Amino acid sequence: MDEPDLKDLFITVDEPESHVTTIETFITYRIITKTSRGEFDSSEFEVRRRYQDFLWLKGKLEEAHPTLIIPPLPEKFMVERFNDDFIETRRKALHKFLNRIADHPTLTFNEDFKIFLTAQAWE
Structure with missing residues (x-):
């Protein structure tokens, strides 16, 4: 049976860092997403994204x-x-x-938004 959730998200964007790969240096941003202000019974994911990753997301949302x-x-x-x-x-x-x-009632449930906020998660 389901535990009802308010579908809140609280997102911060911080700690810009230089990611030096062998073929390119680019800036990434720490995105931390929480589903509650409480201590327990909640989701929290930390990911790192470059600006091109946000452009990917924008395009997916436009298409959908x-x-x-x-x-x-x-x-x-x-x-x-x-x-x-x-x-x-x-x-x-x-x-x-x-x-x-x-905050948007249809965009917030998009699958690629979810993947964007959770893939390649950091500790």
Whole structure:
């Protein structure tokens, strides 16, 4: 039998880090998602995502909800990408983006949003 849930999500976006792979360096953001303000009987996942991962998500949401305007993620086309203002501006925008999806009555239940918030979870 089911335990009824209010379908609340609380999302933070923080701790930007440089991810240096062998072929590319890019910034990632820590996304922590909680389903409750309580200590017990709840879900909490921590993942790390780059901006391209958010663009993937936006596209999936657009495809699934073609009559909606999905919350925007503007970008203007080698130093600035690692600039403190650039990163902090983006962090705030990504937090706003994820909150808008989380609060939206159809977008919040999208399967790719769920995968986005949970895949490759960190301890």
